C-alpha cells in the first residue's frame, strides 16, 4: 500500500497474509471460517498446489508469522474463465484445512449483495503488506489507505487504461496517484462501508506502476463473481 498508514489490531480482521513456504506472496479476505477470497494470478501453476500455502490471520507483522502459527490451505480454486494475459476474471478461492476461530482480531467481511447502489466515486479502503513505494520490499506491517471508486467509463479513457477495463474489473484509487495498492497487495481486499456493514467489493488484481498519475489500481469485480463463489462453497458443503 502506497500512501497509507499502519493498521491497528482488529481494524481489518478479514485480512490474511498468504504464504508460499512461509513467505508472504499474496493477500486475501476471510468470508467464512474456512473460505478465503484471493486473486487467480496468485495461484497459477505451480502455485495451484494447496500444499505450499498457509494463511495467517489476526497478525499484523510478518515477523510474527512463524512456522506452525498459520492455517494450512486444503483447496485452491481459480476462476475457470481466468485469462492470465489480460487478468480477466482474476479471482480465486482458498479453503482452509481447519476452520478459523473468530474473535476481536479475526472476523469475516461480507460478500456484496445485488443492488448495493454504490456511489460512482464510493469511498473504499485497501489493505495489505505490499510495498509502500514502487519497487519497494514487502511491508513488515499491515497498512491500509482510503481510495475512491473510479467509474469504468473514466478508467477506460484513452489517457488512462484505454479500454482494458472489462466488466469483471473495477478501478479504484486517484487519477492524481499518491495512494494505491502495490506489489505484494495482490489478492487483498477492496472494501466499502454501507448501511454500517463492510462489504468486499474488489480483490487487488493489477495496475501500471504504483501510485502514478492516471494509472490507478484495478480490482476483480467481486459482485460479478458471487454466483461462482456461492457455487464452489455449495459444491464443497455436500
Amino acid at each position: 500500500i502506497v500512501g497509507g498508514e499502519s493498521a491497528l489490531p482488529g481494524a481489518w480482521p478479514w485480512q490474511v497474509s498468504l504464504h508460499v513456504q512461509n513467505v508472504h506472496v499474496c493477500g486475501g479476505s476471510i468470508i467464512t471460517p474456512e473460505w478465503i477470497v484471493t486473486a487467480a494470478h496468485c495461484v497459477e501453476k505451480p502455485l495451484n498446489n494447496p500444499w505450499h500455502w498457509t494463511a495467517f490471520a489476526g497478525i499484523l507483522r510478518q515477523s510474527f508469522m512463524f512456522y506452525g502459527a498459520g492455517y494450512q490451505v486444503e483447496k485452491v480454486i481459480s476462476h475457470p474463465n481466468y485469462d492470465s494475459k489480460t487478468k480477466n476474471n482474476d479471482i480465486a478461492l482458498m479453503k482452509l484445512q481447519k476452520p478459523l476461530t473468530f474473535n476481536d482480531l479475526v472476523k469475516p467481511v461480507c460478500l456484496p449483495n445485488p443492488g448495493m447502489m454504490l456511489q460512482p466515486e464510493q469511498l473504499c479502503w485497501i489493505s495489505g503488506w505490499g510495498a509502500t513505494e514502487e519497487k519497494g520490499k514487502t511491508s513488515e506491517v499491515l497498512n491500509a489507505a482510503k481510495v475512491l471508486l473510479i467509474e469504468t467509463q473514466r478508467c477506460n479513457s484513452r489517457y488512462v487504461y484505454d479500454n482494458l477495463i472489462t466488466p469483471a474489473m473495477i478501478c479504484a484509487g486517484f487519477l492524481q496517484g499518491n495512494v494505491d495498492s502495490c506489489q505484494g497487495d495482490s489478492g487483498g481486499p477492496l472494501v466499502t462501508s454501507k448501511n454500517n456493514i463492510w462489504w468486499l467489493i474488489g480483490d487487488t488484481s493489477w495496475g501500471s506502476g504504483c501510485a502514478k498519475a492516471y494509472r490507478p489500481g484495478v480490482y476483480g469485480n467481486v459482485m460479478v463473481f458471487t454466483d461462482w463463489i456461492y457455487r464452489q462453497m455449495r459444491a464443497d458443503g455436500e
Partner: nanobody
C-alpha cells in the same frame, strides 16, 4: 534474497545447457525456487520449480521430459539442466521466488541479475 543467474549461451537444435541460480539470503526464502523464460514480444512463461528439500519438482508441459531441475543447498544453488533444445526455447531465462514472480504489475521488469540469455539457432 538475492539471485544471480548464469549459464546461458548459444546452441544449435539438439544441444544442451545447464543454468545456475545462486541465492544469497535467508534459506527460509528459498523454499520454492522457479525458472521462467521470456522471448521478445511474447508473454512470460513458467518453466520449472523445485522445493528446498528437492522432494517436489514442477515442469511446464512444453519442457516436460527434456529439462531437469535440482538443488545443492550447501551452495544455495538451483540448477536447470536443459537437453534437446529447439529454436522455440530461445528466450531470456529468469530464476525467481514466488514473492517475486507473483506480480501485481506483470509488465514490471525483473532484475538483470536474475536472468541469462539462451539462444538456439543453427
Amino acid at each position: 534474497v538475492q539471485l544471480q543467474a548464469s549459464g546461458g549461451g548459444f546452441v544449435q537444435p539438439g544441444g544442451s545447457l545447464r543454468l545456475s541460480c545462486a541465492a544469497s539470503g535467508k534459506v527460509v526464502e528459498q523454499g520454492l525456487m522457479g525458472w521462467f523464460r521470456q522471448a521478445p514480444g511474447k508473454e512470460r512463461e513458467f518453466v520449472s520449480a523445485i522445493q528446498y528439500d528437492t522432494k517436489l519438482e514442477y515442469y511446464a508441459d512444453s519442457v516436460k521430459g527434456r529439462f531437469t531441475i535440482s538443488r545443492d543447498n550447501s551452495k544455495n544453488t538451483v540448477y536447470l539442466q536443459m537437453n534437446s533444445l529447439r529454436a522455440e526455447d530461445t528466450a531470456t531465462y529468469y530464476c525467481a521466488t514466488p514473492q517475486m514472480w507473483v506480480q501485481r504489475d506483470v509488465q514490471a521488469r525483473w532484475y538483470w541479475g536474475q536472468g541469462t540469455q539462451v539462444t538456439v539457432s543453427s
